[model samples]
Target: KGNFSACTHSFGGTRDHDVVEEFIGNIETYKDVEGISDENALKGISLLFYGMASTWWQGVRKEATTWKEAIALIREHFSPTKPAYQIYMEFFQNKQDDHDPIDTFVIQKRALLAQLPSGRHDEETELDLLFGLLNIKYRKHISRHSVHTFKDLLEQGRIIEHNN
Candidate 1:
């Protein structure tokens, strides 16, 4: 039996943690596990790409002299080490504003935090960061109530939304 496993996920021209975990890592592990170092691992890789990536790879496939460099090119384009400070500035400076529906407001804030690289602050601090930036509209009511536990804000937020 082949030592390598079947790759279930395909790259669709965009990526994040799952890109690394599922796509790249799968190949890396597959490459290593093979115990058959062909040097040009990309040669056997026909199933990895889909849609945009499938066409994209055919064009750039030859640019990489070695399988190693192909991995680099993929990492460079599909996934990014998002600029930490840039993400921080956006995440910290922008508080919720009026006019945005609660639905949209949470999404933008969620976007900011997701872009920031992991392994600096922590989950609890991250939790508070979102809690603190709640729109001033209903934030005052929650602030007076003393605390926000997990699920607490969403619960209170919706109640306030309906009452007004």
Candidate 2:
């Protein structure tokens, strides 16, 4: 077998906590660097915050107000580190004051997922393709996989869940 272990494993030093701290450190250290614009920094923060919210949302609460408040608090805890903390602080403030910002982010993610499908749409099609393989293997004939048929099946619209 390849070097695979059944149980969970860690390579040691480079844990998720350490990696996050490093990025947070860089975010703060580069605050004055013109190369690191607020817009770009905010994107990084949003990505981090989204993971925090989506992943922890179930354990915390279900209501929209509750979600916003909870995520705000989650971001606030990182405030001690200055750059990382301050970015997060603003994020919390913005979220607490209005749901518009969070709503916008949701819309953006929906767009990305639309561009590149996920979950069942992804899984079902691949399974269907595998079944198709059986037909090709057993039958005497087959047409080349048509681009339109594939794209049409995948591109059909649907609601998306935001999982951590």
Candidate 3:
């Protein structure tokens, strides 16, 4: 792991953050990337194989239920629940339905917004995303700049729904 010299571009690697990230990212990934404790547990679990990894840990202050803790504590490498593109696909690929009110589209998209890792979401972003996904009836008349806020966006869409 100390072999960092073999590591990128003009803004690249030389015992730099690039190599550190590479080593971490190139390792066991989900568990191995984020959790240093997870790595120790892997060999530590080996203490039955774990004893050196095992007996070392067995020297612990706790004479508590050692076996269960080893498996339970050492095994889990908890990671983020969803993928980036999966979040994109849900939000961007959605289409507003023919009979469903424009308010419904706003309501549903909020659910996906709640799931976003990006907390930088603002009303403009919602408008930016929603403009393309509206039904053609409204879309044919709608332009991206016509409604600047969510209130106008929803109300304008409602007026269009009433007009035709």
Candidate 4:
């Protein structure tokens, strides 16, 4: 995942960054748009996805056993009382409760992968990454109107479930 550098727009612009690279791939995103010259338009979207991904990951190398645990991990990581966590807590806690879209899918993703053969890669990881991206995008649209809660997002989708 390439780090998303914060560019100042004007004089003395204050900036805060979310997750720059913590999802399927840390590489650069929207190469097509960047080539076409409408890069700015995609910034906000990319940032949002970054948020969704980073909110789920405390560190790039870190991993969680369950999605709920992941969200809980981030919530604690970005505790509002602590300045280090304030930027993330502020961005995420404003819209909804303590739930994060990224964590929800992280758990769901793990569950899905469990059903696949161990130590192998195929359509499973692909589907997991694709659906993970979709969950964030879908939430952005469905989240505002109070139409869907984060819990609903997890339950509404069809995903693989495991016994353990």
Candidate 5:
């Protein structure tokens, strides 16, 4: 019932949205599968946390009586309040350089985009930000393609790789 691998492997630092979701989801999975009681479920999640996260958990350990409490605390700490416009502004200001690898740019941009509040921007706006940020060379390639949507843009991007 207790697997540290699931713990360590799932945690990908507090900044990683996917990792946080997966870690919490895994805990829920374990709780349901093992029929772990509330207190035990709380303990299981806490055991998996390490480094600063673990230290933070220790400080609030006494206050947390259930898994929900612990998860809320961790989520609140990891995803602090940041204005949607601030995140959007950062994404808009970011630009891909000629020397910047496509993958590296994509990862950084995606992380920044993910921080924005859901539905704050429409699909067209999101795609615009990504496309507009690309280097001029790649931008030319993207423009030549019949790509009219985000999915098409991504497919076109894959083909543009290795040129840089």
Candidate 6:
């Protein structure tokens, strides 16, 4: 069956990267499960590209006859180029915005941290920053816990939210 969701799931560079990769990964998994050939996968996956990504695909599709080649083109085009300092700055400055839950804010901060170049910061520091930036009401409560990992901190935050 044709994937309608893939048709609308446009890859808009860095911001949409996680979604794009997950969409492509799903297509690849479906191909494996249904015993679809590489050529068919390439054709189906090609349908997923849109907008600027589609324009980029037009130039490479002729050469990207294989599924691997098509994915390579997409990945190469959206490769992470932002400096570690930039990602670090974003991670450091992130705060729980209005209507944004502590868990959601922590998740976003961790995602940004993951994108930073290797050796930029360790998980301990990342967890500390996440804990520090949390809403003070929650931060005050969370500080009482001995949680060392982001997951633990998020869980504890949720527990506090649920309790209060």
Ten residues in sequence with the least summed lDDT for candidate 1: 1-10
What would the per-residue lDDT of candidate 5 be over residues 1-164, giving only the tens digit for each residue? 53422543445356856667777777777667756556655545655656776666667678876567777876776766577678767777756666766767766776677765677677676666577667777776667346656557666677787544
Query: What would the TM-score be for candidate 6 when compared with the true structure?
Result: 0.71
Q: Write the per-residue lDDT of candidate 2 for residues 81-147, one digit (tens) a residue.
A: 3444443344334221222323343343333333222343563454343333222221222233422
Better of 3 and 6 by TM-score: 6
| Candidate 4 lDDT score relative to the true structure | 0.37
State the lDDT of candidate 4 residue by residue for 1-164, as single tens digits: 22234422211111221231122122224333233233333333234334444444324424655434544544454432224344334333333223344455446444434433456656444443334344343444433333233454454432212211
Per-residue accuracy of model 6 over 26-116 as CA lDDT, tens digit each: 7666666657545666656656556776676666667875667767766666764576677667666656666677766655665666665
- Tens-digit per-residue lDDT, 1-164, candidate 3: 42222222111113333333343345435344345454343443321221133443456526335434543433232223466778788677767767788877788777666555676677787778767777788777767657788888778778877887
Ranking by TM-score: 6, 5, 1, 3, 2, 4
> At residue 100, what lDDT does model 5 achieve?
69
Q: 1 or 3: which has the higher TM-score?
A: 1
| Residues 1-164 of candidate 1: C-alpha lDDT, one tens digit per residue | 34234656566765665546467776667667656466445455666677877788778766877776777887778666768787777677876777765667765666557665567767567667777777678877877445445456567777888899
Query: Could you tell me which residue pairs clash in candidate 3?
Result: 46-49, 46-50, 47-50, 47-51, 47-54, 50-53, 50-54, 51-54, 51-55
Per-candidate RMSD, Å? 6.1, 21.4, 16.4, 17.8, 4.0, 3.8
Estimate the lDDT of model 6.
Answer: 0.63
Q: Give the clash total for candidate 3.
A: 9
Assess every candidate by TM-score. 0.54, 0.19, 0.46, 0.18, 0.69, 0.71
What's each prediction's clash count? 0, 0, 9, 3, 0, 0
| Ten-residue stretch with the least lDDT total in model 3 | 4-13
Candidate 6 all-Cα RMSD = 3.8
Residue clash pairs of candidate 1: none
